[PDB]
């Protein structure tokens, strides 16, 4: 799906 | 903080 990453 | 908004 859609794709949020916080590093 | 940091946004993504799939509408």
Chains 1, 2 share one sequence.
């Not at 799906?1 to 590093?7: D, K, R, S, T, V």
Request: proline share 0%; aromatic share 14%.
């Amino acid at each position: 799906g859609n794709n949020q990453q916080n590093y």
